[PDB]
């Protein structure tokens, strides 16, 4: 149902962004007590969701793996309804998607340890093909976390070769220790992700905790050392710090905070949307923060802004 | 939060049944489309739930393992509301319970898989219980070591006079292989006084010629009372070499057979605990299941 536009050998009618990672079934409190609404979310998927709203004229694709059950079909449908191109989704027979439940104090429970999405880097050829004509390929530290050793290698090799042909690679380290076997493995693998990326979107609070960065500018230096060309350091309610080809700066973030979920994912979409438009980095960061600011004044992961 | 009665050295004021296995979170459709109601279920827990309803005068305990998150605490509270003694539940920090959505399942990493991790805790749960009930699902979710631990505790309990009841409850998807499944089920039979197989599932996997052959297979494993369920057909039984059949009264307006076996099992065990003859207990069990399927 989603319009993929047209193409010739040289150009496509639509700008193309690919997001790679895991989308999950989400059950969140409904109005009637004891009941829950079924939706879909997951960090990289949320970013794609916001992108589709920001640029409905563009092609926003999602690459992942789902099962073959009712719930998987439901997820596939929800993607199309959101204007997201799920044509590349791998189907893994006998399996289902990951799920999480929000209970309400607000708490989360996850069942994603055996999700189909963990097989998303099982087919190297399908990955390359998904990336081949993408203007931007976006992935996260959660994308890396859920894969085994071979899957990580396959994904990183694909991103690196895509990068070399001229795809712009964007990465949100999105540190979630509970998804990794150990902190050593997490930090190492995250920086492997950095080494294939042009744009990195770390969050200072998390980076400081695990890498021992003394401040946001030290966070930026760390990613620049891995070859990242544009580092954008998200910083809670504080100014966003950046570092691009040796040049530094800070972009003020106006004071606005119901729900800091989706903040980072919406920020990323706002940033990538503006970068694709050919806007200078500082302009893109301002747009990213403006979107995130309006989102954190909203209810949920997916806030119709 | 559930009264457990009183005791002296010789007798307890309440008869005591312990069920061992996995309780899961269940999400089922509510009226509002796209919304689901959260409840708790799972084979051995369902049997315990029905048993508690049938005998408010008794102590119905559940032994399992849960997590330490909000959902696990909700499960604990639901058990207590249902009159079930969850005082022996083990808590596995960082883990959560299994879940299913209406059937799609997430149970491969549930805390309940650790329920046989502490041998002393299992033995204490079984002490002074009159009946200990478990299923083939209880066995399926454990690793090899947990299986050995549980079976050894069950056999030791049986050696001390606890009555052991088993429902094979064959579920192929939960096992690594067909062979492992059949061998382990029969190991469960080997520690059980009472077995409650279902002919439809047994026949597909053991090659039983008919319900009497199913009964014979369990009897060779040392089961004293075998009660073979068979959908709407007569229940066959075998007890100490004596065969019999008990009719299942026809039910026309059938609605949901999911809890049929678990409610049958509770009905049977309730009547056995009351000292009713096996044929009487089977009829009581059929009657309850009949109401439940409607
Ligand atoms: N308390 C807040 N006040 C204003 N903006 C925020 C706040 N929290 C998050 N944001 C925005 O969301 C982005 C993501 O921040 P982070 O949560 O550190 O990933 C920030 O860079 C801001 O643009
Ligand atoms: N179609 C049916 N009509 C009447 N009773 C049933 C039916 N299905 C199941 N039951 C009852 O539930 C018990 C267990 O069913 P099953 O475990 O599916 O063989 C039977 O022994 C009957 O007492
Ligand atoms: Cl985490
Ligand atoms: Cl006393
Ligand atoms: Cl099964
Ligand atoms: Cl008898
Ligand atoms: Mg009664």
């Amino acid at each position: 149902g989603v319009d993929l536009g047209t193409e010739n050998l040289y150009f496509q009618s639509m700008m193309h962004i690919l997001s790679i990672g895991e989308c999950m079934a989400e059950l969140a409190p409904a109005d009637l007590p004891g009941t829950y609404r079924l939706g879909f979310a997951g960090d990289t998927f949320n970013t794609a969701w916001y992108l589709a709203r920001l640029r409905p004229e563009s092609r926003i694709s999602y690459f992942s793996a789902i099962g073959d059950d009712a719930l998987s079909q439901q997820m596939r449908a929800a993607m199309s309804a959101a204007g997201i191109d799920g044509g590349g989704l791998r189907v893994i027979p006998g399996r289902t998607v990951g799920l999480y439940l929000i209970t309400l104090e607000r708490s989360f429970a996850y069942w994603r340890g055996q999700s189909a999405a963990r097989e998303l880097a099982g087919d190297a050829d399908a990955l390359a093909a998904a990336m081949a004509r993408a203007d931007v390929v976006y992935f996260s530290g959660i994308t890396l976390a859920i894969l085994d050793q071979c899957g990580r290698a396959t994904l990183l090799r694909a991103l690196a070769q895509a990068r070399a042909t001229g795809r712009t690679i964007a990465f949100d380290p999105n540190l979630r220790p509970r998804l990794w076997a150990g902190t050593g493995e997490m930090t190492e693998t995250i920086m492997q992700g950095a080494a294939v990326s042009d744009i990195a979107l770390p969050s200072f609070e998390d980076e400081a905790a695990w890498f021992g960065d003394a401040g946001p500018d030290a966070t930026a230096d760390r990613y620049a050392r891995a070859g990242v060309r544009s580092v954008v350091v998200k910083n809670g309610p504080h100014a966003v710090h950046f570092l691009q080809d040796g040049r530094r700066g800070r972009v003020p973030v106006p004071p606005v905070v119901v729900d800091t979920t989706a903040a980072g994912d919406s920020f990323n979409a706002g940033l990538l949307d503006s970068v694709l438009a050919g806007q200078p980095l500082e302009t893109a960061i301002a747009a990213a923060a403006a979107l995130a600011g309006q989102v954190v004044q909203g209810k949920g992961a997916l806030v119709e802004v």
Side-chain angles (χ1 to χ4, degrees), chain A:
Chain A
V2 177
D3 185 8
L4 305 184
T6 62
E7 60 174 57
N8 49 64
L9 294 182
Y10 313 106
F11 306 95
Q12 307 159 263
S13 67
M14 292 176 176
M15 295 295 282
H16 191 182
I17 311 172
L18 175 70
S19 177
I20 304 174
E22 175 167 19
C23 179
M24 285 173 292
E26 167 193 276
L27 279 103
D31 288 315
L32 194 72
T35 73
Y36 295 84
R37 179 158 289 105
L38 178 56
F40 299 94
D43 70 323
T44 46
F45 176 82
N46 300 338
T47 298
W49 191 90
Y50 285 104
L51 281 166
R53 293 301 180 287
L54 290 168
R55 39 173 66 247
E57 72 278 5
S58 290
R59 181 174 178 197
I60 310 295
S61 297
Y62 198 71
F63 188 84
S64 189
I66 66 180
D68 58 7
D69 62 351
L71 184 59
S72 296
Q73 301 166 12
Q74 274 203 109
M75 180 181 289
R76 189 189 275 274
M79 287 197 192
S80 300
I84 292 164
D85 165 34
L89 293 168
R90 296 226 298 128
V91 173
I92 313 292
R95 281 161 77 180
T96 189
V97 297
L99 177 142
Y100 70 95
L101 172 78
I102 299 162
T103 53
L104 208 68
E105 183 190 319
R106 192 177 190 95
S107 67
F108 295 69
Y110 287 88
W111 297 263
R112 66 190 303 172
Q114 312 186 321
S115 62
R118 298 178 78 89
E119 320 298 342
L120 66 81
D123 186 334
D125 296 348
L127 269 173
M131 300 179 186
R133 298 194 77 164
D135 294 293
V136 170
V137 182
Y138 171 73
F139 73 117
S140 79
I142 296 178
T143 306
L144 295 176
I146 64 171
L147 302 169
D148 60 11
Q149 271 308 312
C150 290
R152 288 172 190 161
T154 296
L155 174 58
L156 293 164
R157 285 197 281 255
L159 292 162
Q161 191 58 33
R163 188 193 195 173
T165 69
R167 322 289 72 188
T168 298
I169 306 304
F171 178 51
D172 184 331
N174 239 24
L175 313 183
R176 302 293 190 269
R178 282 141 222 174
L179 297 179
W180 300 87
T183 85
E185 187 171 319
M186 177 179 68
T187 52
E188 294 167 17
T189 308
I190 288 306
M191 297 308 299
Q192 295 173 5
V196 296
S197 308
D198 293 305
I199 298 167
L201 300 145
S203 297
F204 174 60
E205 239 181 342
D206 299 338
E207 309 288 320
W210 300 106
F211 288 94
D213 302 332
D217 292 319
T219 302
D221 292 338
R222 178 162 49 76
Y223 285 98
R225 239 133 50 191
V228 180
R229 305 280 303 291
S230 304
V231 190
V232 179
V233 185
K234 293 165 289 183
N235 194 17
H238 305 115
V240 174
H241 292 234
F242 68 87
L243 171 56
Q244 174 172 275
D245 295 353
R247 176 172 65 94
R248 295 184 192 276
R250 312 173 176 183
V251 181
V253 182
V256 341
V257 185
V258 183
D259 211 309
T260 49
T261 303
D265 298 334
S266 73
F267 179 100
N268 291 356
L271 184 99
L272 292 172
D273 172 53
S274 183
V275 166
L276 281 155
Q279 299 304 300
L281 185 62
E282 291 106 318
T283 301
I285 294 165
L291 174 59
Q294 263 4 90
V295 165
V296 294
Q297 302 172 34
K299 39 163 180 137
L302 307 168
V303 195
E304 282 186 10
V305 80

